[PDB]
Amino acid sequence: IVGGYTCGANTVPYQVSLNSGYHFCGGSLINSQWVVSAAHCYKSGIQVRLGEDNINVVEGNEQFISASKSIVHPSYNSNTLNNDIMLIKLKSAASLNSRVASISLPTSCASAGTQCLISGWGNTKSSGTSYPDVLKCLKAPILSDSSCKSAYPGQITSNMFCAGYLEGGKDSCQGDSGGPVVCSGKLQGIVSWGSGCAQKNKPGVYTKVCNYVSWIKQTIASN
Numbered sequence: 678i679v680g681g682y683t684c685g686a687n688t689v690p691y692q693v694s695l696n697s698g699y700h701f702c703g704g705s706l707i708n709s710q711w712v713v714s715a716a717h718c719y720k721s722g723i724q725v726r727l728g729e730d731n732i733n734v735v736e737g738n739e740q741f742i743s744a745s746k747s748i749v750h751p752s753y754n755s756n757t758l759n760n761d762i763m764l765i766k767l768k769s770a771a772s773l774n775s776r777v778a779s780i781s782l783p784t785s786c787a788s789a790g791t792q793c794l795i796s797g798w799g800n801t802k803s804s805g806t807s808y809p810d811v812l813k814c815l816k817a818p819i820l821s822d823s824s825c826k827s828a829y830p831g832q833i834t835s836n837m838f839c840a841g842y843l844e845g846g847k848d849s850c851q852g853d854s855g856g857p858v859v860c861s862g863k864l865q866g867i868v869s870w871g872s873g874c875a876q877k878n879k880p881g882v883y884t885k886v887c888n889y890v891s892w893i894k895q896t897i898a899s900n
């Protein structure tokens with residue numbers, strides 16, 4: 678996250694870190710046994726880390742649980758990033774409390790102008806590299822579809838939205854991928870792609886979760 682603030686320990690209780698020997702992507706806990714992340718974060722050998730603040734220090738609220746099954750969306754296209762969503766099943770259920778909690782799925786899609794919270798452990802610089810150890814947060818609005826399409830001609834599908842600031846300076850960045858965009862207490866986006874980080878006229882692009890609720894629910898019911 679570029680241009681954000683330190684969230685505070687366990688203030689984003691649905692945020693997870695995906696670990697394969699190191700943090701590589703975020704995700705969101707949607708019930709006690711399932712996480713949703715970005716398809717472009719897929720790899721084998723995932724450990725899900727819940728209850729994290731500092732990802733390099735054991736602070737006492739962590740739960741570390743291996744994945745048993747990953748499911749990339751059937752129509753994910755790695756060239757265009759259309760349908761950039763995956764589900765991860767945990768080998769055992771997490772123990773839910775005030776510091777480790779699920780986030781609700783939306784019943785309706787959010788409109789442009791709605792303020793949302795984006796969070797992650799990704800790079801904090803738009804030039805160069807500095808990775809934080811503690812969770813960072815950013816408040817940002819959903820942008821109109823017309824603004825989003827004008828920023829990225831030919832690249833925005835109905836399964837994507839833009840959020841952030843056209844003036845630059847505040848955005849998600851590398852290592853934030855897969856993490857949550859929460860608006861009015863519901864999961865509306867997944868950190869997906871963008872051009873650089875925090876550049877003028879190049880806002881972040883997010884997977885539009887409201888289009889996937891039926892697939893999520895059906896998949897969880899059957900796996």
Ligand SMILES: N=C(N)N1CCCCC1
Nearest residue numbers: 849850851870871874881
């Ligand atoms: N929001 C931006 N700029 N991103 C998404 C996360 C990876 C880098 C590009």
Ligand SMILES: [Ca+2]
Nearest residue numbers: 731734735736
């Ligand atoms: Ca920790």
